[PDB]
Design an enzyme around this catalytic site. Structure first.
Site, PDB file in Angstrom:
ATOM      1  N   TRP A 111      -9.143   6.511  -0.600  1.00 10.86           N
ATOM      2  CA  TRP A 111      -9.431   7.298  -1.782  1.00 10.86           C
ATOM      3  C   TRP A 111      -8.435   6.883  -2.863  1.00 10.86           C
ATOM      4  CZ3 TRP A 111      -8.110  10.155   2.804  1.00 10.86           C
ATOM      5  CH2 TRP A 111      -6.744  10.504   2.882  1.00 10.86           C
TER       6      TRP A 111
ATOM      7  N   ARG B 141       0.146   4.584   2.911  1.00 12.52           N
ATOM      8  CA  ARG B 141       0.218   4.362   4.349  1.00 12.52           C
ATOM      9  C   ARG B 141       0.704   5.556   5.169  1.00 12.52           C
ATOM     10  NH1 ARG B 141       4.039  -0.537   4.772  1.00 12.52           N
ATOM     11  NH2 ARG B 141       4.494  -0.104   2.541  1.00 12.52           N
TER      12      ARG B 141
ATOM     13  N   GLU C 187      -5.056   4.065 -10.655  1.00 10.89           N
ATOM     14  CA  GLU C 187      -5.859   2.869 -10.398  1.00 10.89           C
ATOM     15  C   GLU C 187      -7.074   2.824 -11.318  1.00 10.89           C
ATOM     16  OE1 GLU C 187      -6.271   1.640  -6.049  1.00 10.89           O
ATOM     17  OE2 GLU C 187      -5.697   3.765  -5.782  1.00 10.89           O
TER      18      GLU C 187
ATOM     19  N   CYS D 275       0.833  -1.201   0.000  1.00 13.08           N
ATOM     20  CA  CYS D 275       0.000   0.000   0.000  1.00 13.08           C
ATOM     21  C   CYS D 275       0.869   1.252   0.000  1.00 13.08           C
ATOM     22  CB  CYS D 275      -0.938   0.022   1.216  1.00 13.08           C
ATOM     23  SG  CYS D 275      -1.936   1.553   1.324  1.00 13.08           S
TER      24      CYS D 275
HETATM   25  C1  HEM Z   1      -6.233   6.634   1.908  1.00 13.48           C
HETATM   26  C2  HEM Z   1      -5.828   6.524   0.634  1.00 13.48           C
HETATM   27  C3  HEM Z   1      -5.191   5.214   0.102  1.00 13.48           C
HETATM   28  C4  HEM Z   1      -4.518   5.149  -1.040  1.00 13.48           C
HETATM   29  C5  HEM Z   1      -4.194   6.325  -1.991  1.00 13.48           C
HETATM   30  C6  HEM Z   1      -4.081   3.786  -1.233  1.00 13.48           C
HETATM   31  C7  HEM Z   1      -3.334   3.328  -2.302  1.00 13.48           C
HETATM   32  C8  HEM Z   1      -3.189   1.999  -2.643  1.00 13.48           C
HETATM   33  C9  HEM Z   1      -2.854   1.480  -3.953  1.00 13.48           C
HETATM   34  C10 HEM Z   1      -2.602   2.345  -5.214  1.00 13.48           C
HETATM   35  C11 HEM Z   1      -2.789   0.148  -3.860  1.00 13.48           C
HETATM   36  C12 HEM Z   1      -2.489  -0.808  -5.030  1.00 13.48           C
HETATM   37  C13 HEM Z   1      -3.865  -1.355  -5.385  1.00 13.48           C
HETATM   38  C14 HEM Z   1      -3.850  -2.081  -6.695  1.00 13.48           C
HETATM   39  O1  HEM Z   1      -3.080  -1.667  -7.589  1.00 13.48           O
HETATM   40  O2  HEM Z   1      -4.622  -3.062  -6.841  1.00 13.48           O
HETATM   41  C15 HEM Z   1      -3.104  -0.229  -2.487  1.00 13.48           C
HETATM   42  C16 HEM Z   1      -3.155  -1.502  -1.944  1.00 13.48           C
HETATM   43  C17 HEM Z   1      -3.562  -1.841  -0.661  1.00 13.48           C
HETATM   44  N1  HEM Z   1      -4.050  -0.964   0.305  1.00 13.48           N
HETATM   45 FE1  HEM Z   1      -4.016   1.055   0.227  1.00 13.48          FE
HETATM   46  N2  HEM Z   1      -4.530   3.027  -0.173  1.00 13.48           N
HETATM   47  C18 HEM Z   1      -5.245   3.866   0.676  1.00 13.48           C
HETATM   48  C19 HEM Z   1      -5.887   3.458   1.843  1.00 13.48           C
HETATM   49  C20 HEM Z   1      -5.882   2.207   2.433  1.00 13.48           C
HETATM   50  C21 HEM Z   1      -6.529   1.799   3.680  1.00 13.48           C
HETATM   51  C22 HEM Z   1      -7.415   2.727   4.561  1.00 13.48           C
HETATM   52  C23 HEM Z   1      -6.249   0.489   3.870  1.00 13.48           C
HETATM   53  C24 HEM Z   1      -6.639  -0.479   5.016  1.00 13.48           C
HETATM   54  C25 HEM Z   1      -7.171  -0.063   6.177  1.00 13.48           C
HETATM   55  C26 HEM Z   1      -5.401   0.051   2.780  1.00 13.48           C
HETATM   56  C27 HEM Z   1      -4.874  -1.213   2.610  1.00 13.48           C
HETATM   57  C28 HEM Z   1      -4.341  -1.704   1.441  1.00 13.48           C
HETATM   58  C29 HEM Z   1      -4.008  -3.091   1.173  1.00 13.48           C
HETATM   59  C30 HEM Z   1      -4.132  -4.268   2.162  1.00 13.48           C
HETATM   60  C31 HEM Z   1      -3.524  -3.170  -0.068  1.00 13.48           C
HETATM   61  C32 HEM Z   1      -3.063  -4.477  -0.751  1.00 13.48           C
HETATM   62  C33 HEM Z   1      -4.327  -5.060  -1.405  1.00 13.48           C
HETATM   63  C34 HEM Z   1      -4.008  -6.291  -2.220  1.00 13.48           C
HETATM   64  O3  HEM Z   1      -2.951  -6.933  -1.951  1.00 13.48           O
HETATM   65  O4  HEM Z   1      -4.810  -6.639  -3.132  1.00 13.48           O
HETATM   66  N3  HEM Z   1      -5.221   1.109   1.933  1.00 13.48           N
HETATM   67  N4  HEM Z   1      -3.322   0.933  -1.779  1.00 13.48           N
HETATM   68  C1  LIG Z   2      -8.545   1.177   0.434  1.00 12.24           C
HETATM   69  C2  LIG Z   2      -8.006   1.331  -0.966  1.00 12.24           C
HETATM   70  C3  LIG Z   2      -7.668   2.585  -1.462  1.00 12.24           C
HETATM   71  C4  LIG Z   2      -7.164   2.697  -2.762  1.00 12.24           C
HETATM   72  N1  LIG Z   2      -6.840   3.897  -3.288  1.00 12.24           N
HETATM   73  N2  LIG Z   2      -7.031   1.604  -3.526  1.00 12.24           N
HETATM   74  C5  LIG Z   2      -7.338   0.377  -3.058  1.00 12.24           C
HETATM   75  C6  LIG Z   2      -7.164  -0.826  -3.946  1.00 12.24           C
HETATM   76  C7  LIG Z   2      -8.454  -0.988  -4.748  1.00 12.24           C
HETATM   77  C8  LIG Z   2      -8.684  -2.440  -5.160  1.00 12.24           C
HETATM   78  N3  LIG Z   2      -7.409  -3.102  -5.467  1.00 12.24           N
HETATM   79  C9  LIG Z   2      -7.540  -4.016  -6.614  1.00 12.24           C
HETATM   80  C10 LIG Z   2      -7.096  -5.158  -5.719  1.00 12.24           C
HETATM   81  F1  LIG Z   2      -7.971  -6.140  -5.628  1.00 12.24           F
HETATM   82  F2  LIG Z   2      -5.869  -5.568  -5.997  1.00 12.24           F
HETATM   83  C11 LIG Z   2      -7.100  -4.207  -4.539  1.00 12.24           C
HETATM   84  C12 LIG Z   2      -7.836   0.212  -1.769  1.00 12.24           C
END
Ligand code: HEM
Ligand SMILES: Cc1cc(N)nc(CCCN2CC(F)(F)C2)c1
Ligand code: HEM
Ligand SMILES: C[C@H](O)[C@H](O)[C@H]1CNc2nc(N)[nH]c(=O)c2N1
Ligand SMILES: C[C@H](O)[C@H](O)[C@H]1CNc2nc(N)[nH]c(=O)c2N1
Ligand SMILES: Cc1cc(N)nc(CCCN2CC(F)(F)C2)c1
Ligand SMILES: [Zn+2]
Lengths: 420, 414
Positions: A290, A121, A295, A118
């Site tokens: 958000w 973070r 994405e 992520c």
């Molecule tokens: C607040 C703005 C946030 C942004 C901009 C953001 C951004 C991202 C992005 C760009 C990815 C890659 C997703 C993909 O390409 O499929 C990601 C993955 C992920 N995010 Fe964040 N995120 C945010 C908030 C959060 C929150 C609130 C959580 C959990 C409480 C979180 C947990 C995760 C997890 C676990 C992944 C890995 C998901 C997977 O392995 O499929 N994110 N995030």
């Molecule tokens: C909380 C959150 C914020 C963000 N900005 N983006 C994501 C990922 C959106 C869905 N992703 C495709 C997947 F399945 F790999 C997880 C999650």
């Protein structure tokens, strides 16, 4: 040894990682083979496939309670020792235990903090946690999810949130959100063999239809919620449309862009992952933040097995599509991501570009090495899917390791559910 | 044992058994992945060389369907004599060619490996002086350049002996542009090459002080002090960069050289170390267009291009950097194709690599690949490799990094 260095090759900043010494489970890699680009490299889990024995659960509980009481500058205090004995009795008499509100909040925030994939973070400690552990039916799950979506959307000023449903017990009484995200568009298999809508969601769309959903058969049909409570058969619910904020996509220069009829939703809300805290498994834990613009504009719109709209944009732009070397795909890809960002910003819907997000992440890494001794990070996922090397994370070395509490993948419920 | 790798776009699933043959370290442990570390972490004795040599000879005779043969057993016998008597051994010409080609085939960071078996090997193991090295390198450049129809080639100098007589090319590539820091903090030319440019000037080079000065060769034979040589300018093919729609692009005065030729790596074959082994192919456009021109510590021309494009350079979310990066890369490819100098765009190259990877899994049981390096530095997910799971492991023969020679060389004169 006691430290591993990571180097940024642009700035020559070197960071020193000791936090990895606390890593618990296998990455999948070895001395001889690196699995860093495998989607699911490891099945190493902290407790067996269902209800553990005491000797399996209690050590994981003690480790988390120990970590929580250390985190607040106790360890060994009266309340720490009592909590241990209270968890001990609870396991003895129920085969599980229940987290305190403070522990639940600590655990959820640290799962996000530990999510090495992520890039968002830097915001990890500003997470709103809705305790939904008193829920008993799919109707109650729907009410909790509606409130989450309304709070998180906040009329466009988006707020990160997680809603946490009852933990797993024996594995036959799981709470599950069958949707992979709370809000996604349907995908329809067409007569000729092409696909209408979002091709990723064809199977889930068909399950919804096969469950009684009447599809309007458009290109941007918000899917229903398919909610399972306490192991029963899942139930369909239509999210009230006034809760689903959407952004029409227009372009600041190309007036023809809006005639493409494109839109996207504002709230990304992952709902198919598992939250693991002290050996407890929360199988329904939808969380939202958000978007980073790529994405939507790179993956959702331009993957071949997704919306695949590079063709149309490129045509309207009058580019040469004879050969790859004109870079028409690259040129249209940029325009689309310009339009997405311009549209969200125009409607005052929170969004971040990949330049700002990756710069934020470098700053987050520095903070974490300074206060925590490290930050687990998965380069393969952190680097944005366009313009990689003109973002600062491209040149940043990263160490990946698995810390608990954590978010984990889990099998899709329709492969495992025995229907009634 | 088997390991599976999946392509998430096509759903194709491949089965790797070749990883069981790996030997050196990846750098990762069971609990930490170092897949994005650039370099994770004195000559072999008789006892160390024996098994390394055997494994290589065994693999060579297996590749030619002669394993267990009388010629196989006699070669092993002969190799162990040499090690026993001289503490080293000498490759046959066939073994050298096979080793060089397989080091390329084994280079997990190289997207261009579909070409691996068409490599022209120049045996330079009889060379003894820097003048001799210069001659060999000139002939390499001329053969590889081929008036723009580029041909892959490698030239192999004598192997390490005691580590006190190493052959080295001090240049990182055979052909690169000088860089000069100015007293006011600015840079003329290529900023990546400032340090090596200083070394040359100190060794006696008289620099033109322009934007595109081809650097001299700094060549070390048999552990002696390195010596300077000017590549004859008619052997250096260059391409002026123009754009097919922006007539003002030519006024930026940009050009690049056609021949990419890495000269600072170490080629390891059967335990033997070839510390000078320059090798060359042809460019993928993004190597010039994304990295060479648009890295912040390189030529850094995003600004000027975006300015002449009239882009809104105030907010990052206008994506002006992304927009200008694409146009620069269009210009690079158009310029090389117009001048009929071999080049490949990142879409064509990653598609070829997927076909190569699949062929390798079929005939060989796998293909070690470094996703971090294979995915191009722009437009990652719209190329097919982005969605391809890959396994990284180290096979020998191999190309390895080695320390820069100015850090370890002990000087002899004055
Ligand atoms: C607040 C703005 C946030 C942004 C901009 C953001 C951004 C991202 C992005 C760009 C990815 C890659 C997703 C993909 O390409 O499929 C990601 C993955 C992920 N995010 Fe964040 N995120 C945010 C908030 C959060 C929150 C609130 C959580 C959990 C409480 C979180 C947990 C995760 C997890 C676990 C992944 C890995 C998901 C997977 O392995 O499929 N994110 N995030
Ligand atoms: C909380 C959150 C914020 C963000 N900005 N983006 C994501 C990922 C959106 C869905 N992703 C495709 C997947 F399945 F790999 C997880 C999650
Ligand atoms: C024939 C056309 C070739 C193409 C299109 C090609 C393409 C590439 C590219 C794009 C990279 C990544 C470089 C970077 O982005 O920094 C690379 C790396 C590499 N290539 Fe190839 N290459 C070719 C030929 C060769 C040959 C002939 C050899 C050796 C005989 C070779 C060995 C390597 C090695 C060892 C690396 C890794 C270098 C490092 O880690 O620093 N390549 N190649
Ligand atoms: C830190 C990171 O590993 C480093 O910037 C790598 C990333 N991937 C790369 N990929 C290629 N092809 N070339 C490179 O120089 C790099 N640099
Ligand atoms: C095979 C490869 O690991 C896979 O396609 C990954 C690559 N990197 C990614 N990075 C992000 N952010 N999201 C993804 O889905 C992927 N997919
Ligand atoms: C033979 C060859 C062909 C090509 N087209 N490109 C290269 C790479 C050029 C420099 N690379 C950066 C590094 F140091 F990693 C090696 C090598
Ligand atoms: Zn690894």
């Amino acid at each position: 040894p006691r430290f591993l260095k990571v180097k940024n090759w642009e700035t020559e900043v070197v960071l020193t990682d000791t936090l990895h010494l606390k890593s618990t489970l296998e990455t999948g890699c070895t001395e001889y083979i690196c699995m860093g680009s495998i989607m699911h490299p490891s099945q190493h889990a902290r407790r067996p496939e269902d209800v553990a024995t005491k000797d399996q659960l209690f050590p994981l509980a003690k480790e988390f309670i120990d970590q929580y009481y250390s985190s607040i500058k106790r360890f060994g205090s009266k309340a720490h020792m009592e909590r241990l004995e209270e968890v001990n009795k609870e396991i003895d008499t129920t085969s599980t235990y229940q987290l305190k509100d403070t522990e639940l909040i600590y655990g959820a925030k640290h799962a996000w903090r530990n999510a090495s994939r992520c890039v968002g973070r830097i915001q990890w400690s500003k997470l709103q946690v809705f305790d939904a552990r008193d829920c008993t039916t799919a109707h109650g799950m729907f009410n909790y999810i509606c409130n989450h979506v309304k709070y998180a959307t906040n009329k466009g000023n988006l707020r990160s949130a997680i809603t946490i449903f009852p933990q797993r017990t024996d594995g036959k009484h799981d709470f599950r959100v069958w949707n992979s995200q709370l809000i996604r568009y349907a995908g329809y298999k067409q007569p000729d063999g092409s696909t209408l809508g979002d091709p990723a969601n064809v199977q889930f769309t068909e399950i919804c239809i096969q469950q009684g959903w009447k599809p309007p058969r458009g290109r941007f049909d918000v899917l229903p919620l398919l909610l399972q409570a306490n192991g029963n058969d899942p139930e369909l619910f239509q999210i009230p449309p006034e809760l689903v904020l959407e952004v029409p996509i227009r372009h600041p220069k190309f007036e023809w862009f809006k005639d493409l009829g494109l839109k996207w939703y504002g709230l990304p809300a992952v709902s198919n992952m598992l939250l693991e805290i002290g050996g407890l498994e929360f199988s329904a834990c939808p969380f939202s933040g958000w978007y980073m613009g790529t994405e939507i504009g790179v993956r959702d719109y331009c993957d071949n097995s997704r919306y695949n709209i590079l063709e149309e944009v490129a045509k309207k732009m009058n580019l040469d599509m004879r050969k790859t070397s004109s870079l028409w795909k690259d040129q249209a890809l940029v325009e689309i991501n310009i339009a997405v960002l311009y549209s969200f910003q125009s409607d005052k819907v929170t969004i971040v570009d990949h330049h700002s997000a990756t710069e934020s992440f470098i700053k987050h890494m520095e903070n974490e090495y300074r206060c925590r001794g490290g930050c687990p990070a998965d380069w393969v996922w952190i680097v944005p899917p366009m313009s990689g090397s003109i973002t600062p994370v491209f040149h940043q070395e990263m160490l990946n390791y698995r810390l608990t509490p954590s978010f984990e993948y889990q099998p899709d419920p329709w492969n495992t559910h025995v229907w009634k």
